[PDB]
Write a structure and sequence with these properties.
part of a larger assembly, 2 chains, 87 residues, two-stranded antiparallel sheet, two-stranded antiparallel ribbon, elongated, binds ligand IVM, binds dodecyl-beta-D-maltoside, binds 2-acetamido-2-deoxy-beta-D-glucopyranose, binds undecane, transport protein/immune system, Membrane protein, transport protein
């Protein structure tokens, strides 16, 4: 588990997968591990920064309606950045 | 850039604390702009000179606070 940083090996199972083929019936075992993806990374690199990005687009609701250049600059930069992040 | 060369982990790295903090200092800068600009256009001169006062304080408070941060940060992770 220490050499597996990105996931968490939650469960394992030991089963049989014997099958009937055209050349005959072959005996077969199957072990299965269950990998849960670590969330801390996606919290910090995806969710947090997107909220921080959406929240910025709101601070333009507090600029006077006369200074539209400021509003567009915010709304557009946050939208563009949003794209990049997703890419 | 930095985060792309790293594997996703389950803990918070000291690199995260540092990017996150600087991120805030810039976020609060924007916030200040809105606060200043908003109470600025308000008709009464009561808010107007307050608007001016917020800048004067920011011009010093931000640097001081950021310097304070560095001190805490480096003593915590440079050890
Ligand atoms: C607070 C979010 C809002 C949107 C604020 O965002 C900003 C400013 C604007 C808002 C006020 C910007 C944001 C940082 C935050 C400030 C956050 C910190 C200084 C640190 O985190 C805090 C909160 C965190 O808990 C959310 C908490 O962890 C606890 C609770 C968790 O459980 C909920 C649990 O899992 C965990 C184990 O223990 C932590 C101890 O402390 C710091 C860790 C944050 C770093 C953020 C980033 C680092 O690189 C990321 C990337 O490069 C990017 C593009 C944006 C950055 C960012 O998003 O920057 C980034 O994602 O402020
Ligand atoms: C170091 C360089 C900074 O420069 C200095 O900054 C401060 C504010 O932070 C300015 O002082 C500021 O506040 C005072 C408050 O009464 C105003 O009179 C002045 O109009 C304003 O500019 C100084 O005029 C300027 O000399
Ligand atoms: C792991 O955990 C749960 C609990 O028993 C179970 O439902 C699941 O099938 C298991 N997965 C694997 C791959 O063994
Ligand atoms: C009384 C106002 C003093 C303002 C000084 C601002 C200095 C900022 C330096 C940041 C490196
Ligand atoms: C660790 C967060 C520090 C944020 C300081 C913001 C000052 C404007
Ligand atoms: Cl631009």
């Amino acid at each position: 588990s220490s050499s597996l940083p990105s996931f968490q090996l939650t469960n394992t199972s030991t089963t049989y997968c014997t099958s009937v083929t055209n050349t005959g019936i072959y005996s077969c075992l199957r072990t299965t591990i269950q990998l849960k993806r670590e969330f801390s990374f996606y919290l910090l690199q995806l969710y947090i920064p997107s909220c921080m990005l959406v929240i910025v687009s709101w601070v333009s609701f507090w600029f006077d309606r006369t200074a539209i250049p400021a509003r567009v600059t915010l709304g557009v930069t946050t939208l563009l950045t949003m794209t990049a992040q997703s890419a | 850039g930095i985060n792309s060369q790293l594997p996703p982990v389950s803990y918070i790295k000291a690199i995260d604390v540092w990017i996150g903090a600087c991120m805030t200092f810039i976020f609060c800068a924007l916030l200040e702009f809105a606060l200043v600009n908003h109470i600025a256009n308000a008709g009464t001169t009561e808010w107007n000179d307050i608007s001016k006062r917020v800048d004067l304080i920011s011009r010093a408070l931000f640097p001081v606070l950021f310097f304070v941060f560095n001190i805490l940060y480096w003593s915590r992770f440079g050890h």
